[PDB]
């Protein structure tokens, strides 16, 4: 579950209950009732209330259920926001004791218009946790031996072990292979171009062979290995992924009469 939470993309919008922009001209005489009880703690010995501080207040609420589900910390969120934007925001934040979980943010563009733009950027792009292009991650114990870890015991027997495996929606293979405690030998994806750009051409040969075998044998039918091997070899022979389309086949250096009989009849002869 720790790996799951470290692997899943989470924006600030998912953990934010609601957002409100207040006008709060002076630091101490706040509009809100409870924030007096930490505004005093922050401004009785004021952190950088040294230059002027802006009348416009941004106030985000964080749902405790989502906050504690993903093992987030308000200190972590403040650190991430402050690092991502620099010093151009001042972040004021509560201890976990506060029931209403508030993150008070203060700052040519006009103040409120820039602050609305900030909100719309943060909600969408803050990228709190995990790897982007990873929508959801599922965790389960496989029942099929092809996903079960099978090892050789001290007696030389084959013993199948059940270990938790993850299946993501969305693919970013390189950074997942980088990740701590992810198994680099066996971690694989179903995307062919991603495997190309990451592992090279022999890896695409094998992965494409596996994908074709899976999609053919899912129905229960059986096709001999030689045809699958020939298809993969023909697709990967020239060193790059030759798609079986007009583009991939007619970019081979073959005779023009062969090319005109497939999908580009007149243009091939014109170019030749």
């Amino acid at each position: 579950k720790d790996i799951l939470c470290r692997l899943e993309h989470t924006t600030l919008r998912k953990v934010t209950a609601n957002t409100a922009i207040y006008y709060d001209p002076n630091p101490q005489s706040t509009v809100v009732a409870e924030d007096q009880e930490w505004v005093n703690v922050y401004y009785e010995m004021p952190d950088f209330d040294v230059a002027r501080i802006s009348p416009w207040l941004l106030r985000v609420e964080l749902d405790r259920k989502h906050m504690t589900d993903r093992k987030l910390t308000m200190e972590q969120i403040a650190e991430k926001i402050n690092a991502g934007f620099g010093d151009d925001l001042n972040c004021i934040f509560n201890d976990d004791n506060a029931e209403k979980l508030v993150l008070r943010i203060r700052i040519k563009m006009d103040d409120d218009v820039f602050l609305r733009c900030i909100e719309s950027n943060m909600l969408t792009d803050m990228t709190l946790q995990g790897i982007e292009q990873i929508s959801k991650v599922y965790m389960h114990l496989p029942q099929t031996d092809n996903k079960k870890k099978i090892i050789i015991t001290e007696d030389g027997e084959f013993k199948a072990l059940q270990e938790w495996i993850l299946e993501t929606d969305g693919v970013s293979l390189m950074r997942v292979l980088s990740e701590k405690d992810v198994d680099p030998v066996r971690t694989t994806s179903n995307d062919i171009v991603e495997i190309f750009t990451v592992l090279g051409i022999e890896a695409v040969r094998k992965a494409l062979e596996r994908e074709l075998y899976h999609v053919i044998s899912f129905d229960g039918s059986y096709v001999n290995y030689r045809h699958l091997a020939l298809l993969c070899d023909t697709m990967t022979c020239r060193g790059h992924l030759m798609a079986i389309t007009r583009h991939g086949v007619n970019r081979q250096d073959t005779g023009p009469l062969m090319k005109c009989s497939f999908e580009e009849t007149v243009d091939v002869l014109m170019e030749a």
Partner: protein
Amino acid sequence: VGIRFCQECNNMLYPKEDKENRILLYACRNCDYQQEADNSCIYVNKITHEVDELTQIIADVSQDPTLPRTEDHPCQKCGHKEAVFFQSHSARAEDAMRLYYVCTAPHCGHRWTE
């Protein structure tokens, strides 16, 4: 919160800050007319939509003959047995099956949820 309109020209008020003074006001740009604001909030955004639909649903749906109705759940104020029930219509919530109930009598507009 929401729109207010200028009195002089029936156009949108939008907010401006009194630069010399630190008070917010509403000023309609089409004229000179101004209002030091009561709404210390200018923009609120209910991102999680935890809101129950009781205000959206309305008493006249009690007259729909194709809706189901049970005698089990009584109304609070009058306790008439008959009450039509139906599902939510909010697209975006942590739940999607709770039943909204409306009192069936012609003269008791009352509503609840379970």
